[PDB]
């Protein structure tokens with residue numbers, strides 16, 4: 001069960017990331033608040049999901065979902081670039097992050 | 105400059121991380137203050153960098169520097185095992201960061 | 209401009225003013241307003257303070273009774289609207 | 299260890315000015331909790347808290363001629379056992 005709320009922890013990680021992009025320097029009220037509470041939610045669900053699951057595998061999935069989701073929702077909502085070079089270089093960047101967190 | 109802000113934000117991401125574990129239950133004054141200052145600085149610089157950069161790129165690189173600096177600090181300031189796997193994982197990390205910076 | 213809008217003095221006193229404004233639609237609300245007040249035409253610089261953006265009112269105390277002042281309400285950025293200002297005499 | 303040296307630097311029949319040694323650098327905590335009450339019946343003790351960067355505290359409202367016990371607590375037990383003194387106003 002702690003796997004699924006770890007999934008949702010990474011989902012709210014994507015949530016405050018997109019909410020921060022909508023706030024423009026943390027100046028627009030409501031996206032700024034979604035950023036804070038969505039970050040608190042992600043931290044709290046993570047603390048409970050890690051109480052049972054391995055710390056290395058929990059964080060690797062938590063940041064993996066948060067990073068990839070921010071990349072996908074970025075190119076979707078804010079119409080961010082979809083270059084063949086950009087998709088390759090972030091694939092390399094995400095595997096490195098997922099790898100290092102899964103080894104500690 | 106927005107990229108420069110990202111690197112510094114990732115630097116303060118790891119300083120509050122290891123200052124948090126060196127604090128106890130948020131009970132030691134000096135470490136708890138370093139975490140709080142490190143957290144606020146990391147969130148402020150990240151929020152400023154998101155204004156001019158895509159959120160999928162800003163989130164991934166900001167996490168990448170934090171995870172990279174976490175392992176760099178672990179191997180040096182903690183007598184952490186260095187593996188061929190962790191080396192190539194850091195190489196994928198630095199490659200993705202530089203590559204994304206190179207397609208600006 | 210966009211925000212703020214309808215800046216007015218709700219209540220007043222020889223030494224204090226109670227002002228308000230319209231924050232706009234929910235998508236127009238902002239994190240903070242910075243508020244400026246000072247003697248109009250005087251050789252004195254203006255004083256300033258910030259108020260959380262989930263508020264539409266603010267009080268200004270310590271004013272000289274019988275002097276005309278000017279009060280302005282700024283948004284976080286000028287990208288939304290230009291600051292609105294009013295003149296009130298205590 | 300933390301904290302230590304709980305003195306009564308000043309005292310009037312209705313108040314006590316206490317102090318303590320916080321240690322240095324790596325032992326400074328985020329807050330201390332001070333409790334004061336009559337050495338005997340107590341009924342309940344009176345308590346308050348002070349931020350960790352401070353090392354003094356004032357206890358007011360005491361009844362003159364009553365022996366009070368004053369204890370100083372750290373945030374957790376992993377610091378060095380509580381401190382406690384007795385004092386008649």
Ligand SMILES: CCCCCCCCCCO[C@@H]1O[C@H](CO)[C@@H](O[C@H]2O[C@H](CO)[C@@H](O)[C@H](O)[C@H]2O)[C@H](O)[C@H]1O
Pocket residue numbers: 024025026027144147148151284285286287
């Ligand atoms: C719980 C964690 C708390 C997080 C703390 C984050 C603080 C949130 C508000 C930050 O405000 C920023 O300050 C800049 C100034 O320092 C502003 O630049 C502004 O500078 C000029 C002000 O004169 C304006 O005209 C410009 O439009 C504008 O770029 C900028 O807009 C604004 O985003």
Ligand SMILES: CCCCCCCCCCO[C@@H]1O[C@H](CO)[C@@H](O[C@H]2O[C@H](CO)[C@@H](O)[C@H](O)[C@H]2O)[C@H](O)[C@H]1O
Pocket residue numbers: 239240242258259260261284
């Ligand atoms: C206390 C309520 C706060 C709740 C909002 C939470 C996040 C905002 C925190 C305050 O933000 C700071 O306030 C300054 C206010 O001074 C602003 O600087 C601005 O104000 C200066 C005033 O001299 C000007 O020069 C410039 O417009 C600019 O630097 C600027 O927004 C920011 O550094």
Ligand SMILES: CCCCCCCCNC(=N)N
Pocket residue numbers: 057060061064065068098102
């Ligand atoms: C798109 C989410 C990516 C999450 C990373 C994949 C799982 C990592 N766990 C391992 N044991 N290797």
Ligand SMILES: CCCCCCCCNC(=N)N
Pocket residue numbers: 039117143144146147
């Ligand atoms: C209650 C203070 C809120 C400031 C939070 C600072 C950023 C923490 N989140 C990260 N992903 N690093």
Ligand SMILES: CCCCCCCCNC(=N)N
Pocket residue numbers: 188189192
């Ligand atoms: C180009 C050098 C590639 C070196 C790869 C080392 C992999 C070793 N890890 C195992 N689990 N066996």
Ligand SMILES: CCCCCCCCNC(=N)N
Pocket residue numbers: 242256257258259260
């Ligand atoms: C909720 C705070 C109430 C307003 C008092 C603080 C005003 C400080 N002025 C600045 N320009 N920062």
Ligand SMILES: CCCCCCCCNC(=N)N
Pocket residue numbers: 231237261262263264
């Ligand atoms: C928990 C809801 C928080 C909503 C914050 C805004 C409040 C009202 N907006 C104003 N401009 N007055």
Ligand SMILES: CCCCCCCCNC(=N)N
Pocket residue numbers: 255256257259265266267268269
């Ligand atoms: C209760 C509404 C906001 C209170 C603001 C008080 C006046 C400004 N403060 C200064 N220090 N200048």
